[PDB]
Amino acid sequence: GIGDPVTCLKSGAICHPVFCPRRYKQIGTCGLPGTKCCKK
Amino acid sequence: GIGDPVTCLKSGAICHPVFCPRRYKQIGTCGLPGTKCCKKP
């Protein structure tokens, strides 16, 4: 359900290009192509 | 994404049947309709 940067950041996650960095779980995208919404 | 209760709970979040309570934010669902995967920022 998470597909835009504002929603991602509001959820306490971080937007990153191409992949979530180690430890983080992917919970969605940030809308722009390739971006991942990543929760530590 | 998170769309089932096992994925949700493994990450240390809660599964709530209606809403994320005070201090928690929604990070997905727990599969069943209306359920919310919730975690404190």
Swiss-Prot record, chain B:
GO terms for cellular component: extracellular region; extracellular space; Golgi lumen. Belongs to the beta-defensin family. LAP/TAP subfamily. It comes from the Eukaryota. Changing K25A: Loss of PIP2 binding and reduced liposomal lysis activity. Impaired antifungal activity. Decrease in fungal cell permeabilization. It is found in: Secreted. Disulfide bonds join C8-C37, C15-C30, C20-C38. One of its GO terms (molecular function) is CCR6 chemokine receptor binding. Residues 10-25 are annotated as: Phosphatidylinositol 4,5-bisphosphate (PIP2) binding. GO terms for biological process: antifungal innate immune response; antimicrobial humoral immune response mediated by antimicrobial peptide; cell chemotaxis; chemotaxis; defense response to bacterium; defense response to fungus; defense response to Gram-negative bacterium; defense response to Gram-positive bacterium. The chain holds residues 24 to 64 of 64 of the full protein. This is Defensin beta 4A. Induction: Up-regulated by TNF, IL1B, Gram-negative and Gram-positive bacteria, C.albicans and bacterial lipopolysaccharides (LPS). Up-regulated by inflammation in skin keratinocytes in epidermal tissue. Monomer. Homodimer.
